[PDB]
Symmetry: C4
Subunit: 463 residues, 4 copies
């Protein structure tokens, strides 16, 4: 029959050793996999942190070198308010660029033809964009504008070791002013420490943005970095990671296939013996969710390791997707560690408590999500104009989540005390809104989450 | 009789389909209403955010243009402390106003006669207010003051492209100095993006307030904006919103009326059959609270949509009331979504847990509110002089609420460590006050809220 | 006998009306008392806030007028680091004092003889204190100091509308430099609004403190204010407050005396009937704790009202003690409001839950206080040198309390990440200390408080 | 037999008095020990705080004296960005050092030969370090570097009351620039207050660090202090501490030895009477854990007191280890205070509740630690480049711990809203990561901790 086969299946690894004397291969392989994946992620994180620190420090140096009157911390408020200030900022940026070799503490090299498409072989491009026809005249509300964008460009070349000074900005119809150039440096730490030199090409963009046309022109500098190679153990270890995950995926897929075949045999033998309807959950009882998690983590690790091999060879530079894949896979394997604790009764009590509480917790989350969403919409529409924490829907959701978790509460109240929402009515509404929301979610909703978990634990302890 | 009528009534929509074969019309109509109300609120919020951002950026530009030595973040501390500083601030504001066209990054137009009532056709009014008779002499405490307010005005006209320099401030009897003028600009983003041009008239008020007579004269700039039209789908969609809510209100009112008639028939038939006293709750059992919520949300949505139509046509500019109405209605419909979850048993368990816990929670709120109020009064009276967070009763309440919810606790303690309330006694009292309050409300009151919710859940699970 | 007397006693006010038809006099009198005490405290708080605001604004103006290079917010860091800086600060303070009448926005009058004991009729005293013999010579560690303090004074008189410039500071043996003078002003708001003029005499003290002898000399300005009268309903309302509290105290004391006499009769009649030992709690069962609270609040209100009458007449100026008395009395009466809720069963359930939980809560507080104190001592001794939040024992206690209540946690961790306690060992110890403390108190101690409250509620619900 | 011996053993101190009439000696000795240890730690903390304050104030004065354009709070951002700025900072530091005697408010003495190994008898050493061969040329990626470090030194001597101006920095190959000198001062507070003079020798190090080679050269000043004696009750009290702890350790060790002998007699008598297997816990039942704690605290106190005697005599200066030992011992004795509360039933209820809950709490901590670690690794790898709170693994752990305890939540969300992780994908991942983590740990894990404690309390109350 099959009761002997279903006995060996659905049975603990410790009991599995007693029958047929099968050595635990999947058991040790998963531990080895967890070790190697954690080590690989740690090494990747360390190298990435070094690269990130180099990029950030160089960008800060660029901001102090090219932005007129720049101080640390004033990034989102750095702006120009007069025509002379804008002219001075643009001219200071270009002049500092032209005298960079003998003022800069870092060794940056000019890149010929680095100004972008609007630079035809010139290193720096000084571009101003404006509408084709502005005809803005608020004296008697006579408007006549052609929304076509005109790009006026000035070509700047560094000296071999002043046209741009004759720049006329069409202030009434101006869209933005941009400065494009590239700087090339060599990461010395790589040239000494790991003996693998890295050549960085920073693409500096300085924007004087006037798209709001509000009299305030913010100024920002952003840098894009391209890391080439100047004209191992990690690769071998990344090969070990791929092999271990491949073997783990193979074994887990084999186990899943055997489970599927066994459940098919069971469901046909039920109808053969006593015709009865197989429940959907009973079919789902033959598939081990831990193996689905294991194959998911194996696939994520393999893809992330391929992308990591591409990145380490300076061919991909897609750090975000690779980091997400590796982090998700590592999270999944460290979560899958719980399967070993499910073999011991006293840990299984707590794990089963969480498992039996989870459906009710999800149902209550669905119940309270609609109240949460209504509060989010109401707060965004009413407090959005007046409260800095309510400007966007995502910001409102973050603020309300922190409020229900007991964080940043007094600042939310105090922001509304400052200007009183420019109307006693808005202040009173904010009072009612915040007090009712915080009281409802903390004293009732959180308490009900506690009650659900306590009830699940009570059922587990006394079945 | 009526037991057949009361069976169809008071019965689930799924069961309602089986009897008489009535299609669910109110069911789908409420879903459509929720969708259209949420979409309308999102569109309104996006447009309002654009308008708010334009206003804020222009006001920041005005502050940087007209306030002498202004830096971002120093709004509530910006003040003058000497006579020369006040003169320089006033003169700088007027001079910047007079040279605005050739310094400003935005295109602002002068408004003739924009200085207000004290400007008889002049664009800028420079007004100083002082008492009729001051005779302030602290040398030997000889006071003689006439509380009549005298308004001395200077008329300033922009050049066609210096009387105000002879300004003598009566410093000993001065009340405030104000500068009134208007600037007109065109929101270019509207002129391009939505092809509907908007003409903004900012009314700038610069106040040099000396009403405290404390030697410190704060300086602030506030702007009032009037949005006209320079010389659709939203309107049609707002018509759909009104129609949907009108139909929903009609159906809900019809259902409420039928319920009232049915309960009248029931209460008369009770006395006809067996004379017994109808309980107040039993009469209240015939009215569906969900329909009261639905009609309330329908009325709020209709009023808010009418005001939104008025605002979008540049006729109302009452954004606060319209936003409050729309937000409250959207919150109400998203709360009313719960009625659908009450049809399913496993969600109904949690909803009924909250419902049966609510009366005890309100009773305990009433019990602890008096302790909370006593603490608020005591903290306001004792810690008000010394603690920045205890200056007003509303501020005290906000601080204590954040304290009981575990927020901004260390800052409250640290503010009292700084100056020690200028007396060891006040510091010791603040120690006892804060420790006792936080210990009482967190360890006992919150725990009792948890206990009440747990007890209600236990009663629901095991009736 | 006495069972009829004990029946009328120990009985609810509603039941008390049915027997003997006694009108509730104490019931309405306490409500009136709560009303009048709250109104009195609110009026007192409003007037005190006006006075505090005037004082603070004048002190800020003084700081901007007399402290060289002073900016807002730099109060605890304002210091001098060179001899020239100290000379310049002292000279700037004196020069600004001498030209105050024609630079200051407020109208301050010179006070002749206001420099204190070291000024013999002069308005300003410029005092430097130093040791009699310093002989400080770190070249070869030759010390010879006489700890006697010498006070060298310079007398400064304002002009009728430069000796101090020849000031030589004994820098090696200097203790501090102080500038004493007084300024007289009239609070104009009082001169108009309430028509009761107030004459303020600010005593300005500028300290250049060198008692640390650490090369850094902090500079601070502190002001003492004396409010005289320039050469009602509140008084009548404060008389009503005294009368109401006197009558309440009389009635409550009479009730307490009757209870004492009744318990004496009961305890003698027990021995007369059946000789048995009266329990200590049984004797304590005859005294109503609410009446003890009422007499305490009455006495506090009477004392605070007497002191308030003294203050309002400009005879006391002891605001701290009066405010503490009034606030404590108001807190006590608002707490005593609970007695009315004890008459209704559903509120009595919650109140009795808290009452029966309180002894166990206090016992657990005693149990966990010793662990808390050990953590406080350990953190003060180890993290005190390196952590700004652990400098003093009270500061350590405040930090740990906020930590267990889930506030300011990440900043505490981040302060230790910054310098790592200048030793990996201290950083590791801080890691273990903070993690163990927060885990122990939040996950175990707070949970046990919740469990105690839940158990008390369960006993109350099912006796 | 031994049932009479085991009766006197394993028995409360109050019961122990009734049998054999033994006076409680260990009982009073532990109270005396707690008192003397707390007093000793308080005295040590006060003296250490005075020393720490002197060091910190002198270091702040040094920063204001020697760092060009230094302001308070700008320590981790203080940096140079141009060659001229670096030259000016170095020259300003040396010039201020050379004119220190007539500008400084503190009395600092030059130390001849205080520049360190690179100063051969000179007081100040101005050292620049650079690679032997740099040949850095990013123009065409021609690198040729010799990682050997060359130390170029300039010798500076103070005047008896300019070579360094000819300093040429090899900017392309520069590693760092350091300035070494020593200053000697006498703590005057010690010279007066405690009449024990202290001679401080500060070793000032100014670093211009270019090891990142990123164009930004941070500047920092760090001071090492050596406290000698210029050319009691505490010692006697520290002798009392050693004697008390020695006697306590002797008595506790004697009790532990008697317990071991008694358990050996019991285990042999069991086999003599009825051969049965002694359980491991039963053997562990004979050893009092409180005595192990007492001997541990005694040893820690003795070692810390020896080191404190060494420190107070200016022979050790190892404050960290001594402070850790004393703090840990004081924490242990204040924890051991609980043993007295275990003698009383109502406190024993709560203590036993915690004790029986502890194993399940540890098991659940192990269960949730793997999920926590997976989240830590994922957040470090993905959010590390973009979030300031996720730069290091310890920082990630601290952030997540504060998040689960409801602290610094909105700032974590807002940091990701600012730049959106430079990619919508990273922002969406951070949204999912933070929401899922906070929801899982607060609503489920903390609730299960509460449930475990409640269950343990329920078992204790109803065995
Ligand atoms: C300055 O404004 C212009 C619009 O006038 C922006 O031009 C757009 O640039 C993006 C990306 O470079 C293109 O995809 C669009 O097609 C461009 N639009 C037009 C109309 O040319 C430009 O990006 C702005 N500069 C900055 C730095 O934001
Ligand atoms: C400057 O002070 C005067 C009072 O001297 C304020 O005048 C009041 O203004 C409000 C609103 O404009 C009126 O309702 C009052 O009737 C005015 N009172 C008097 C006595 O004229 C004026 O508002 C203050 N200016 C500012 C900007 O606050
Ligand atoms: C400046 O230092 C002197 C000590 O040299 C302080 O003098 C003490 O002042 C207090 C209160 O005024 C008196 O109770 C003490 O008796 C004084 N001691 C001595 C030795 O005279 C003085 O207070 C300090 N000044 C400031 C502003 O702190
Ligand atoms: C400046 O950089 C040099 C490296 O060029 C650092 O020198 C190291 O110093 C430490 C401690 O002083 C020694 O243990 C190492 O052996 C030194 N390395 C070399 C290669 O000499 C120096 O510490 C740096 N200065 C500062 C202030 O950080
Ligand atoms: Na919190």
């Amino acid at each position: 029959d099959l009761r002997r086969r279903l006995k060996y299946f659905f049975m603990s690894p410790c009991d599995k050793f007693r029958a047929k004397g099968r050595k635990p291969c999947k058991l040790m392989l998963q531990v080895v996999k967890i070790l190697v994946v954690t080590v690989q992620l740690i090494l990747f994180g360390l190298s990435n942190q070094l690269v990130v620190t180099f990029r950030e420090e160089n960008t800060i140096a660029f901001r102090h070198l090219f932005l007129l009157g720049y101080s640390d911390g004033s990034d989102d408020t750095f702006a120009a308010y007069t025509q002379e200030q804008l002219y001075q900022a643009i001219f200071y940026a270009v002049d500092q660029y032209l005298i960079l070799p003998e003022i800069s503490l870092g060794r940056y090299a000019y890149v010929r033809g680095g100004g972008g498409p609007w630079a035809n072989g010139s290193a720096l491009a000084l571009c101003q964009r404006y509408y084709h026809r502005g005809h803005v005249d608020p004296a008697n509300d006579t408007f006549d504008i052609d929304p076509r964008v005109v790009t006026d460009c000035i070509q700047v070349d560094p000296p071999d070791r002043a046209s741009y000074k004759n720049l006329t900005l069409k202030f009434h119809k101006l869209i933005n002013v941009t400065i494009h150039f590239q700087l090339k440096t060599i990461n010395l730490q790589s040239l000494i420490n790991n003996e693998i030199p890295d050549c960085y090409t920073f693409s500096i963009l300085i924007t004087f943005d006037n798209k709001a046309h509000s009299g305030r022109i913010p100024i920002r500098l952003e840098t894009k970095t391209h890391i080439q190679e100047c004209k191992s153990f990690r690769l071998l270890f990344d090969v070990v990671v791929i092999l271990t995950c491949s073997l783990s995926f193979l074994l887990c897929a084999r186990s899943l296939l055997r489970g599927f075949l066994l459940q098919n045999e069971f469901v046909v033998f039920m109808w053969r013996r006593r015709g009865r309807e197989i429940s959907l959950w009973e079919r789902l009882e033959f598939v081990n969710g831990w193996y689905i998690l294991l194959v998911t983590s194996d696939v994520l690790t393999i893809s992330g390791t391929v992308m990591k091999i591409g990145i380490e060879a300076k061919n991909l530079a897609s750090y975000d997707v690779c980091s997400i894949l590796l982090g998700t896979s590592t999270l999944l394997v460290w979560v899958g560690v719980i399967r070993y604790l499910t073999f011991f009764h006293k840990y299984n009590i707590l794990i089963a408590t969480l498992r039996v509480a989870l459906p009710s917790v999800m149902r209550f989350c669905c119940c309270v999500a609609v109240i949460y969403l209504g509060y989010c919409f109401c707060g965004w529409i009413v407090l959005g104009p007046y409260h800095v924490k309510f400007r966007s829907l995502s910001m409102v959701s973050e603020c309300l989540f922190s409020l229900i978790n007991g964080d940043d509460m007094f600042v939310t109240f105090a922001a509304m005390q400052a200007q009183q929402g420019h109307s006693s009515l808005v202040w009173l509404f904010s009072q009612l809104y915040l007090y009712s929301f915080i009281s409802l979610f903390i004293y009732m909703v959180l308490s009900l989450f506690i009650a659900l978990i306590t009830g699940a634990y009570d059922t587990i302890k006394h079945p």
